[PDB]
């Protein structure tokens, strides 16, 4: 109910005779929309106003201080899709750590900027053998070519990352071979993958590209 004396209930009024009219209403107004007269109306135990969803996500400590109560907070306003929110330093530290991890993820080593030898026939034979027992898979060959096109150092780094037998677990990052094999043959095939990829690391780009299309045509 909005009134701008109506005997019915009046929840809101929009305005010493004023005081008399306000007290003259049946029941009492919840809020009245009115300075000194507003504070006098406050003195008659009636509320005054004197004229994206906002979300304060924060801890709380309140110092009463003046008549108005407060809570000291230098912080951040974040605008979102349909809401505006208020966060502290720790939110910005968290997004700073996540962004800074995203930064070093980039510009790693020398992108687009000490190797064994074996014949070209040997390299096709070893990649052809490890294609069909699911060690040098298509994802492996793809990420080979991605780490190779950024340089030889990145390809050596990725190959030493995959071939690294972790002393805690004893597990290299290669795909396990398919078929009946004992353990010694499994490590010998992993060493074969090591030597084959590190030996094609020494070759030029068009002698690698032409060796990995007949295994990955979407290199």
């Amino acid at each position: 109910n909005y009134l701008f004396m109506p005997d019915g209930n009046v929840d809101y009024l929009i305005l010493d005779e004023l005081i008399d009219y306000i007290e003259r209403l049946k029941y009492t107004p919840y809020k009245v929309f009115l300075e000194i007269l507003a504070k006098r109306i406050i003195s008659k135990k009636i509320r005054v106003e004197l004229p994206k969803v906002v979300l304060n996500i924060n801890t709380d400590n309140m110092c009463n201080f003046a008549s108005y109560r407060l809570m000291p907070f230098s912080g951040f306003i974040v605008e979102k899709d349909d809401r505006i929110e208020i966060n502290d330093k720790n939110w910005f530290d968290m997004i700073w750590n996540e962004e800074y991890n995203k930064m070093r993820s980039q510009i790693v080593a020398e992108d687009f900027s000490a190797l064994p030898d074996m014949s070209h026939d040997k390299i096709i034979e070893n990649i052809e053998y490890l294609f069909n027992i699911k060690i040098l898979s298509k994802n492996r060959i793809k990420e080979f070519w991605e780490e190779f096109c950024k340089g030889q150092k990145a390809a050596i780094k990725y190959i030493t990352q995959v071939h690294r037998k972790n002393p805690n677990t004893g597990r290299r990052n290669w795909n396990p071979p398919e078929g009946d094999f004992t353990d010694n043959e499994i490590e010998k095939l992993y060493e074969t993958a090591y030597n084959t990829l590190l030996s094609l690391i020494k070759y030029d780009k068009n002698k690698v590209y032409n060796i990995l299309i007949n295994f990955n045509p979407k290199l």
């Binding site: 979102k80 899709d81 349909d82 991890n101 995203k102 993820s105």
Partner: protein, 199 residues
């Protein structure tokens, strides 16, 4: 053509939810930390494909019922054009009348997407043989979609609501077998006139 059905769909997760990243660049940027990222906006809000879920639901139930409803799930399978789900979701010569929006979340990744550790345990040793880290949407996360049906028929509300009950049963997104994607749907339907925007 003078009326349009508008189904406002408000979905709430009862289980953890996973659907996957589809953009190669965001998957690469996330796979330095997370082996299975959720599909997200560039405005940091989770997307869940919705038309395929409703369409797959309706073809399974309408093929179990016995109606002459085609299967568009097989490899490069051409839709027939003369069935119910071809009228609702589409055919070769006619676009589907039910424009199904994406399931856009109400919240943002820092409130709903939680990294997660999954395991693979050896059956003889009971030791973690493998593990991986996938992002996942929490339970109680609310998603909003709008299904806009042009030239509506009588049965379209019942068809969409039945397909939503099927998705409530079976799940939405990925990893549905291990328990992910179990949701509830709330439907607010309303018939509008197509000339509403004209002043």
């Amino acid at each position: 053509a003078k009326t349009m059905k508008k189904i406002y769909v408000t979905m709430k997760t009862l289980s953890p939810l996973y659907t996957g990243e589809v953009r190669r660049e965001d998957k690469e940027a996330a796979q330095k930390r997370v082996n299975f990222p959720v599909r997200k906006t560039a405005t940091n809000k989770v997307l869940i494909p919705f038309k395929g879920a409703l369409r797959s639901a309706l073809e399974i139930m309408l093929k179990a019922k016995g109606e002459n409803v085609c299967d568009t799930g097989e490899s490069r399978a051409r839709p027939c054009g003369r069935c119910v789900t071809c009228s609702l979701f589409g055919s070769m010569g006619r676009a589907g009348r039910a424009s199904v929006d994406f399931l856009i979340s109400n919240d943002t990744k820092e409130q709903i997407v939680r990294e997660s550790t999954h395991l693979r345990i050896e059956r003889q040793t009971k030791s973690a043989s493998d593990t991986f880290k996938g992002e996942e949407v929490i339970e109680g996360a609310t998603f909003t979609a709008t299904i806009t049906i042009s030239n509506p028929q009588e049965k379209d509300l019942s068809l969409i609501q039945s397909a939503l009950k099927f998705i409530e049963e079976n799940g939405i997104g990925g990893w549905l077998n291990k328990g992910y994607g179990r949701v509830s749907f709330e439907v607010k339907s309303e018939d509008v006139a197509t000339d509403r925007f004209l002043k």
